[PDB]
Amino acid sequence: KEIGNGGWDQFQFLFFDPNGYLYAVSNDKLYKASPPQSDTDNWIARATEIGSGGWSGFKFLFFHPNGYLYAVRGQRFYKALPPVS
Amino acid sequence: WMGRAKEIGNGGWDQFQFLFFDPNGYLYAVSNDKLYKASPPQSDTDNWIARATEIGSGGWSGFKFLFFHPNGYLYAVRGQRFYKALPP
Amino acid sequence: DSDNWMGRAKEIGNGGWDQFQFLFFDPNGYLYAVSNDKLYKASPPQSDTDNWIARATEIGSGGWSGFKFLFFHPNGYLYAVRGQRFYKALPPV
Amino acid sequence: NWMGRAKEIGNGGWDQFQFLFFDPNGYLYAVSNDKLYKASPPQSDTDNWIARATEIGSGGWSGFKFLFFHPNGYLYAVRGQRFYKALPPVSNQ
Amino acid sequence: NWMGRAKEIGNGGWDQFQFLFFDPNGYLYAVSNDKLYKASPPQSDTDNWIARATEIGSGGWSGFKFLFFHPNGYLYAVRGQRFYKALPPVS
Amino acid sequence: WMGRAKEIGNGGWDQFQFLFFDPNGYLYAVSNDKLYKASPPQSDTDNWIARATEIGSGGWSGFKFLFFHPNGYLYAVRGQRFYKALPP
Amino acid sequence: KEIGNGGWDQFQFLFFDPNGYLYAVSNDKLYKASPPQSDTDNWIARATEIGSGGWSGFKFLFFHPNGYLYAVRGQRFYKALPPVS
Amino acid sequence: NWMGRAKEIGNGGWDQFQFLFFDPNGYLYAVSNDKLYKASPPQSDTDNWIARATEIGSGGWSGFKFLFFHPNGYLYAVRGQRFYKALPPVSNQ
Amino acid sequence: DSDNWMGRAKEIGNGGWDQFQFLFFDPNGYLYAVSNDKLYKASPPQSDTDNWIARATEIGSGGWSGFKFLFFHPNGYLYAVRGQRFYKALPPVS
Amino acid sequence: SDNWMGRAKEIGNGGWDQFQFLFFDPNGYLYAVSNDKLYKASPPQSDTDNWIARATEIGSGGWSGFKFLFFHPNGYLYAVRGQRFYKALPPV
Ligand SMILES: CC(=O)N[C@H]1C(=O)O[C@H](CO)[C@@H](O)[C@@H]1O
Ligand SMILES: CC(=O)N[C@H]1C(=O)O[C@H](CO)[C@@H](O)[C@@H]1O
Ligand SMILES: CC(=O)N[C@H]1C(=O)O[C@H](CO)[C@@H](O)[C@@H]1O
Ligand SMILES: CC(=O)N[C@H]1C(=O)O[C@H](CO)[C@@H](O)[C@@H]1O
Ligand SMILES: CC(=O)N[C@H]1C(=O)O[C@H](CO)[C@@H](O)[C@@H]1O
Ligand SMILES: CC(=O)N[C@H]1C(=O)O[C@H](CO)[C@@H](O)[C@@H]1O
Ligand SMILES: CC(=O)N[C@H]1C(=O)O[C@H](CO)[C@@H](O)[C@@H]1O
Ligand SMILES: CC(=O)N[C@H]1C(=O)O[C@H](CO)[C@@H](O)[C@@H]1O
Ligand SMILES: CC(=O)N[C@H]1C(=O)O[C@H](CO)[C@@H](O)[C@@H]1O
Q1: Do F19 and F67 form a contact (C-beta atoms < 8 A)?
Q2: Domain spans, chain I
Q3: Which residues contact I49 (CB under 8 A, 6 or more apart)?
Q4: For residue E25, which phi and psi values (nearest 5 degrees)?
Q5: Contact B19, C81 (CB under 8 A)
Q6: Which CATH architecture describes the domain C1-93?
Q7: DSSP B41
Q8: What is the CA(C86)–ligand 1 centre distance, in A?
Q9: Are residues I89 and H5 in contact, defined by beta-carbon separation less than 8 angstroms?
Q10: What is the C-alpha to C-alpha distance for residues D79 and A3, in angstroms, rounded to an integer?
Q11: Residue F81 CA to its chain's centroid (Å)
C-alpha cells in the first residue's frame, strides 16, 4: 505495497514516464515526482532465467546483429539461437 | 489514420474497463471482474479474449487507475488508496 | 497521502490540464494529449512557465475524441479502440 | 595508426568500470562499484559522464560474468551457473 | 546442451583472443598477440578464420581494457583511464 | 592565457547545454529546457542568468546543435532533422 | 523552416563561416557548402528601425568617425547622437 | 593637381552604381540594379571588380535614400520616411 | 521623428549648406565640401556663429563637380568616379 | 543529408573527428583544439591541403580543459573552465 492513503482517486490522470517518473493531473495542474514509497529495484529477481549450468565457463558470449548467439568455450567456437526458458 | 491501420479485433473491445501494456508488450485487460493477459492480437481471427490467460480471477473491477511502472511493477488506485506489486 | 505527495512533487503545469480527453507518453518520452477532437505531441514541460499546449504540434486532425482507448505499445506503435474495433499503426505525423 | 587520429572523449575514471557497452540505440551502459549506469556516450574530455548518468541499478551488478545486449533491446546476463534475460531497467526504483 | 544443439564454427585457437566481437554489419573483429584482425565470421571448422582475416591493426591493440562498436559503426576504447572513439582502421 | 584573462562569471557556467553568440554579440544560453538571451557579462557582480531574457520557455534541451548563421538566423538540429528560423 | 531530414545528428561539428558557408565534419571528413534550402535574405525586414518620419527629407546624412551623426535639412546643418529605436 | 596624379583603378561600368562607399575596414560597397555588392577596392584597370564582388543583397537596395556606415561597422539606411540600422548582410543567403 | 531628432541636435549651421554638391569627412574628422567647381576643407563647424565657408581652405580649383562619387577610404585615400572611370589618390592640398 | 554532403565540397579527408573544438573567428580563420593545443590557419580549400600541418600552434597547453570555447563577433575569445567564464584576445 500500500503506497498511499487519501485522495488517490481524485486525480484526472495518473501515469508514468518511460523512466518511471509518476505524472499526475489534479485540480487542473500537473505534477512529476517519483512515486511515493518506492523500493530498490533488483533486476535479477525479476528476470527470465533461460539457462542453468556452466554459463560462466564461456570465455566469450555475445550476439551478432542478426540475433544469433556466438560463444567461446575452451578452444572451440559456437553459434545457435539464444536459449529460451 | 484509421485509413492506413491494421484492424486487429472486432467484437468486445469497448467493454473493457482498462486496456493497456506492460513494458514487455504483453496486453492487459480488465472485464467481468477479472484481469486478463496475452500478447496483442495481430488480426481479427485471434479471439484474443479466448486465449488470454486469467491472471486475476476476481476483484479487478473496483479500480480507478490500473497501469505499469516501466520496471514491470503494476500500480493501482482502489477507492482512495494506492498500491504496487509485481503482476500476479 | 496524495496531498503531501503533491506537496513534494514538482508543479510542472498550472491550468488547462483537466480538459484533455487523453494524456500519456510514447516510449521515447514525448507527451501526447487529445483535446478538442485533436492529437498533440511535445516534450513534457519541465516547469510552470512552459506553455506546453501552445508549444505542441498537432499530429492528429480530427476524430481523436472518439477513441475509447489510445495508448502506446513499447515498440512505438499507437493502439486505439473505436466502437468495438481495435486498431494499430505508427502514430500520425 | 588509429590511436593518433582518435577522438578522446574522456580524460579520467574510465578504468573503474567492470563493463562498458552499448544498447542497440547507442546509449552507453556501465557497471561501477556494483551499480548500473546509463546515458548517451560522452563527446569531449569535459563531458563529465558519470555525473550525468542515470543510476538505473543500485546493487548486485558486479556479480555478473557477462552483461550484454541482444539487438532486440533485451539485456542478457550470466551470473554463476545461470543465464538470464529481461528488458534493462530504467530506474533504480 | 545448448552447445550440443549449436553449430560448431570453430575448433582451435579460439582462446588465443583477448577481444572477439562484432561491428554493426556483422564483421568479426579479434585481438590476438597485440594485433587486430577483421573478417566475416567462420561457418564450420573447416573454415580457417585467422588465415583469411585481414590484419587491420599493427601494434598496441592489447593495451585496451575495452574495445567495442557503437551501432553507428564508430569504434570505442578504453586505454588506461582515458576514453576514445573513431572509425575503425582499415589496412 | 587564463594568465592575462578577464574573469566575467563565477557560477553555473558549466551546466549550460549550449553557450554562444548571435552576430550582434548577444549571448545565448540553454539550460533547464529554456533559451536565455542577454549581452555578455563583464564581471562577477553581474548575475547574467537573473537578467537574461527567457526568449524560449520550454522545448530547448532536445537539440544536438544550436547556432547562428551570420545573417541572424538560428539553426538547430533536433534528432534527425535540421531547422532554421529567425530567433524568438 | 524544416531544411533537412535524415542524418543531421551524425556530424561531429556543424557550424558557419563568417560568410554563411556551412561546415560539417562527418566520418572524419570536412565539407563546405551553402546550407540546404536557403531563402533570399531581405535585410530591411530584419533591421532595427530607429526613426520614423521625414528621414528622406535630408540632403546629406552621414557620420563623423566620432560616431556623431551629421545632417543637412534645407540650408541648416545639424549634429547629434544617432537616434535609437 | 589631383586628376593628373590619380591612380586609375577602374575603367568602365562605374557609372551604373547608385551608392558606392566604404565600411570602416575598407571593404567597398556598391548598389547596382537593386543589388548589394561587397569586395576589397579594386587596384588597376584590369581588376574586374564586379566579377569578384559578393552579391550580399539581392533585391530592394534601390529604394534607399541613404545607405552608409557608422564607424562601429553597423549599416544605417534611410528608406522613405524610415531610418534603420543593422549589421550589413554577409550573404544573399 | 525627423523633427524630434533635429529639435534635439546641436544646430551647427544656418544657411548656405544646401549649395554643397558633396559634403563628407575624412578619417580624421576634417570636413570636405564641393560647390561651384571647388573643394574646401576645414574642421567641422560647431554653432551658427561659425562661418565655415569663410575659414575653409580651398584645396581644389576646378573640376570638382564633375564627379559622381567622392569619398574617403579609412586609410586616408580619396576615391572618385568620374564618368565611367574610378580613381584613388591622396587628397589634394593647396 | 547524405546528399547535402554529396553536393558539398569535400575539403578535408581524414583526421577531422579528433578535434575537441573547431570554429571560426570573425575574420575567417579556423581554430582547432587537439591534444590539449590550440591551432589557427585559414580553412582548407581542398582535400590536398594538409591543414593540420600548416596550422600555427598558438596555445601551448590546457586547451582540452574548456567546456566552451568560442568567438564574440568583435574578435574576443570567450571560454568556460569548470564553473568559470572568461574573455580576452586570443593567444599568439
Ligand atoms: C475482445 C476479443 O477478444 N475480441 C476478439 C473475439 O472475440 O473473436 C473475434 C473473432 O472470433 C475477434 O475479431 C475479436 O476482436
Ligand atoms: C495545458 C497546458 O499546456 N498548460 C500550460 C499553459 O497553458 O501555460 C501555463 C503558464 O504558461 C502553464 O502552467 C500550463 O501548464
Ligand atoms: C568516468 C567519467 O565519467 N569520466 C569523466 C569525468 O570524470 O570528468 C572528466 C572531466 O571533467 C572527464 O574527462 C572524464 O572522462
Ligand atoms: C553451459 C551449457 O551448455 N549449459 C547447458 C545445460 O546443461 O543447462 C541448460 C538447460 O536449461 C542449457 O540451457 C545449457 O546449454
Ligand atoms: C582461430 C581460428 O582461426 N581457428 C580455426 C583454424 O585454425 O582452422 C581450423 C580448421 O582447420 C578451425 O578448427 C579453427 O576454428
Ligand atoms: C550563469 C550566471 O548567470 N552566473 C552568474 C551568477 O549566478 O551570479 C554570480 C554573482 O552572484 C555571477 O558571478 C555568476 O557568474
Ligand atoms: C576589365 C575592367 O577593368 N573592367 C572594368 C569593369 O569590368 O568594372 C570593374 C567593376 O565595375 C572595374 O574595375 C573595371 O573598371
Ligand atoms: C556654409 C557655411 O559656411 N555656412 C555658415 C555661414 O554662411 O555663415 C553663417 C553665419 O555665420 C553660418 O550660420 C552658416 O552655417
Ligand atoms: C586535420 C587535417 O588537416 N586533415 C588534413 C590532412 O591531414 O591532410 C589530408 C591530405 O593531406 C587532408 O585531406 C586532411 O583534411
Answers
A1: no
A2: 1-94
A3: none
A4: -95, 0
A5: yes
A6: Single Sheet (2.20)
A7: P
A8: 9
A9: yes
A10: 32
A11: 21
Which residues in chain C have Cβ-Cβ distances shorter than 8 Å to A16? 25
Q: With b meaning 16 or more CB within 10 Å and e meaning fewer, what string describes G25-44?
A: bbbbbbbbbbbbebeebbbb
Asked if F82 and G5 count as a contact pair (C-beta separation under 8 A), the reply is yes
Instruction: Give the closest ligand to the alpha carbon of residue J48.
Output: 9
Q: DSSP letter string over D19-80?
A: EEEE-TT--EEEEETTEEEEE----STT--HHHHSEEEE-S-GGG-SEEEE-TTS-EEEEET
Fold of J1-92: N-terminal domain of TfIIb (2.20.25)
- The answer to whether residue H40 neighbours chain I at the CB level (below 8 Å) is no
DSSP-derived 3-state class of residue C42:
strand
F7 lines ligand 6 (CB under 6 A): no
DSSP string, F20-59: EE-TT--EEEEETTEEEEEPPP-STT--HHHHSEEEE-SS
Helix (H) or strand (E) holding I6: helix I2-7
Architecture of domain B1-88: Single Sheet (2.20)
Q: Are F30 and F16 in contact (CB under 8 A)?
A: yes
Distance CA F43, CA H20 (A): 41
Which cell numbers hold the place of E77? 576504447
> CATH fold of A1-85, please?
N-terminal domain of TfIIb (2.20.25)
**Main-chain dihedrals φ then ψ at residue H24, nearest 5 degrees:** -60, -15
> Are F13 and J62 an interchain contact pair (Cβ–Cβ within 8 Å)?
no
Q: How far is B42 from chain C (nearest CA, A)?
A: 9
Residue C9 burial (CB < 10 Å; 0-12/13-18/19+)? buried
Those residues whose C-beta lies under 8 Å from the C-beta of residue H3, and which sit 6 or more positions away, are I63, I82, I87
- Tell me which amino acid residue A11 is: F
Place of cell 557497452: D21
> Alpha helices, DSSP H only, in J1-92?
2-7, 51-54
Experimental method: X-ray
Q: Does the beta carbon of D37 sit less than 6 angstroms from any atom of ligand 3? A: no
Mutate to test the pocket of ligand 3, among D48, D52, D54 (most ligand atoms within 8 A of CB): D48
Fold designation for E1-91: N-terminal domain of TfIIb (2.20.25)
| Cα angle, residue G8 at apex, residues G4 and G11 outer, rounded to 5° | 145
Fold of I1-94: N-terminal domain of TfIIb (2.20.25)
At residue C87, φ and ψ (nearest 5 deg) are: -125, 175
| CA dist., res. G40 & res. H5, Å (int) | 43
Q: All 3 cell numbers of residue F71? A: 545573417
What span, in angstroms and rounded, lies between the C-alpha atoms of I69 and B36? 89
Q: What is the CA radius of gyration of chain G?
A: 22
- Report the relative pairing of strands E75-79 and E64-69 from DSSP bridges: antiparallel
Beta strands of chain B (E only): which ranges? 6-9, 19-21, 27-31, 34-38, 53-56, 63-68, 74-78, 81-85
Write down the residue that cell numbers 580457417 correspond to. E48
* J1 HSE (CA, 13 A, CB side): 19
